[PDB]
Amino acid sequence: KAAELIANSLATAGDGLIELRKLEAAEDIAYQLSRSRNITYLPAGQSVLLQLPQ
Amino acid sequence: LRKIRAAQNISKTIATSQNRIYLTADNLVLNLQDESFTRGSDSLIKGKK
Numbered sequence: 001k002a003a004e005l006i007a008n009s010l011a012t013a014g015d016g017l018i019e020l021r022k023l024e025a026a027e028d029i030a031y032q033l034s035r036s037r038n039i040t041y042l043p044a045g046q047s048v049l050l051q052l053p054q
Numbered sequence: 055l056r057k058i059r060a061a062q063n064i065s066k067t068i069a070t071s072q073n074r075i076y077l078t079a080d081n082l083v084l085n086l087q088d089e090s091f092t093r094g095s096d097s098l099i100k101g102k103k
Contacts, residue, residue, distance in 0.1 A: 036073055036075070038075050041077065044079075047083060049085075051091070052090075052091075054094040054096075
């Protein structure tokens with residue numbers, strides 16, 4: 001039914017509708033094909049003791 | 055459909071996989087010092103009567 005509705009909607013929305021639905025789907029497919037990523041960070045520090053000067 | 059079932063089962067077994075990556079760290083330390091450190095002295099000349 002979803003397909004029927006989508007087809008109907010795209011028909012109303014015209015070709016342009018279909019095209020980018022296709023792009024979205026492609027994006028989805030591409031994501032699924034490769035789903036992964038990471039973020040980079042710069043280094044954090046560790047604790048230390050501070051001595052106050054006289 | 056037995057065929058589909060079996061194919062499904064085999065596909066299921068083979069397919070399973072998953073990956074993930076994140077960075078987190080846990081650490082805790084509590085230092086209690088109720089004091090200003092001593093052993094601090096300048097060089098002075100003092101004398102008493």
